[PDB]
Design a protein around this ligand. Structure first.
Ligand code: CA
Lengths: 129, 286, 121
């Protein structure tokens, strides 16, 4: 929909910052085993532009739809890693500890409309995320 | 038999509509640790917690016997607005009842009340004065209470489970208290934990609907068309129901008042973050 | 008004019998004296035992009690039929009570006639 959304659950009662990077063939992600890639340690690191929004204990990292990828989620507490083969999308939190992280699958409803409103009732209608 | 059509909505926890059926969506509990997880909150001064209940033995001779329930009330009774109604609901079991001939049971209740000078009840529920012929049975007891007008600020409050044994001989009993509940309103809706302890799992999973009949709703699960709810509708922060469809009818609202509604999506005990809120105002009548 | 009437009627009595005018599932009365109630259920003029029994007792003050029967099925039922009736212990002189058999979803007569017999303490 709006984009590709990665949820980061943390222990802060506030709004931790998140910095997103992307890189291929870092140590342990090479297809033919350790150091079988074209640039040992990892190829070009790209900074990914994110739009962040917050609720208590949950950061929602909205990235452009073009970056959308599958993959294993690794939680290292200081950083979250979205590993898809050779590709890694790295999320670095500031001022909190990552509790759990995941690509948002169950997404919140959207076009909320109040119709047929009377003194005693109203009808709420929406659209799936 | 007139042209006026009525939509009837009911909730359940089974696809057939039988498990945990209600014609009314559950309200949140105002009590603490109603689940009897540990000897804390409401059950802080019971003799023990075991299974989902609390066990306590009341014994006395020409005396008032009480156990403090104060730690089991979310918020202080002086916060309740006078004239508002609150409903108390509880499962109770007497495993032993040793009250002789001369011994009389009085002021047997679970009550929030004013103290020194006043003693006026705020929110209470009477417990069975003689359950000797109903021992070892779960009795569900409900009572709606109207908040009395505020007293002098010097007048304090308390929350106690009390009983009075008066007469020649000592009287005693053993009582089990399961799923105690206090909620805002005039209806004892299904047991729910408190707002601070509630999870996605605790809410109804299925919605049942039927139309066009009389204004009053059927009390037979089979009369309804049962679907697994895909959405949860929150009116002013509290859930009021849900649906399989992408639409829901907000009912029993008061005239000329502003409201906020937000919806979430359900996918088998996985609830989405709540949607952006939307505001509306009910019209005023002529 | 009917509270004091019933109290004078059964004043010298150690038993009192009540049944609804519409031969229905609910029975309302004013206990003539502190007593013990026995609830029996009938179908087409014949008493019966077993099935689903959910009895409720309400008072005009707003106190309701709901008793749900689970039969003795923990044995080598098989031979036990339960309930044949329901007994209630602490009724009080002058209090109005409303007894009712709350309708059964699965099974057992849906609309039975109920009888309440009071036995003075
Ligand atoms: Ca009673």
């Amino acid at each position: 929909p709006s984009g590709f959304n990665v949820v980061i659950e943390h222990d802060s009662e506030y709004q931790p910052d998140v910095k997103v990077t992307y890189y291929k063939n870092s140590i342990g992600t090479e297809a033919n085993g350790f150091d079988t890639g074209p640039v040992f340690g990892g190829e070009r690191i790209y900074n990914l532009a994110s739009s962040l929004s917050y609720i208590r204990n949950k950061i929602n990292v909205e990235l452009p739809s073009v970056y959308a990828m599958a993959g294993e989620v690794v939680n290292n507490g200081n950083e979250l890693l979205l590993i898809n083969g050779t590709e890694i999308m790295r999320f670095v939190i500031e001022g909190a500890t990552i509790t759990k992280g995941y690509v948002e699958k169950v997404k919140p409803p959207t076009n909320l409309i109040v119709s047929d409103v009377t003194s005693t009732s109203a009808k709420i209608s929406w659209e799936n995320g | 038999m007139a042209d006026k059509n009525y939509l009837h909505t009911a909730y359940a926890n089974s696809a057939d509509g039988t498990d945990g059926f209600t014609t009314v969506y559950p309200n949140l509990n105002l009590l603490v640790n109603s689940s009897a997880k540990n000897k804390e909150g409401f059950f802080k001064n019971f003799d023990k917690v075991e299974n989902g209940y609390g066990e306590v033995t009341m014994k006395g001779t020409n005396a008032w016997v009480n156990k403090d329930l104060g730690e089991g009330f979310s918020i202080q009774p002086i916060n309740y607005k006078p004239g508002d109604k609150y409903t108390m609901s509880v499962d109770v079991m007497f495993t032993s009842w040793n009250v002789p001939a001369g011994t009389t049971i009085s002021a047997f209740w679970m009550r929030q009340r004013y103290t020194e000078n006043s003693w006026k009840e705020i929110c209470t529920i009477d417990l069975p004065k003689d359950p000797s012929k109903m021992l070892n049975q779960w009795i569900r007891i409900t009572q709606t209470s109207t908040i009395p007008p505020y007293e002098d600020p010097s007048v304090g409050t308390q929350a106690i489970l009390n009983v009075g044994f008066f007469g020649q001989q000592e009287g005693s009993f053993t009582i089990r208290v399961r799923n105690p509940k206090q909620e805002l309103g005039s209806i004892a809706t299904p047991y729910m934990p408190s707002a601070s302890e509630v999870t996605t799992a605790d809410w109804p999973k299925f919605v049942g609907t039927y139309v066009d009949t009389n204004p009053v709703s059927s009390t037979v699960s089979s009369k309804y068309d049962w679907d697994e709810m895909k959405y949860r509708v929150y009116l002013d922060g509290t859930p009021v129901g849900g649906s399989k469809l992408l639409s829901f009818d907000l009912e029993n609202l008061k005239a000329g008042t502003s409201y906020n509604v937000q919806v979430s999506q359900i996918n088998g005990n996985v609830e989405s973050d709540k949607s952006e809120s939307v505001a509306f105002k009910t019209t005023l009548p002529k | 008004v009917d509270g004091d009437f019933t109290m004078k009627k059964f004043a010298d009595s150690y038993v009192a019998f009540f049944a609804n005018k519409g031969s229905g599932n609910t029975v309302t009365f004013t206990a003539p004296w502190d007593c013990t109630a026995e609830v029996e259920l009938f179908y087409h003029g014949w008493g019966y035992s077993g099935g689903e029994w959910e009895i409720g007792i309400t008072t005009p003050s707003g106190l309701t009690q709901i008793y749900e029967a689970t039969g003795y099925t923990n044995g080598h039922n098989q031979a036990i039929s339960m309930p044949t009736k329901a007994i209630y212990s602490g009724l009080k002189k002058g209090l109005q009570y409303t007894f009712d058999i709350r309708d059964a979803n699965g099974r057992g007569p849906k609309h039975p006639m109920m009888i309440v017999k009071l036995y003075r303490n």
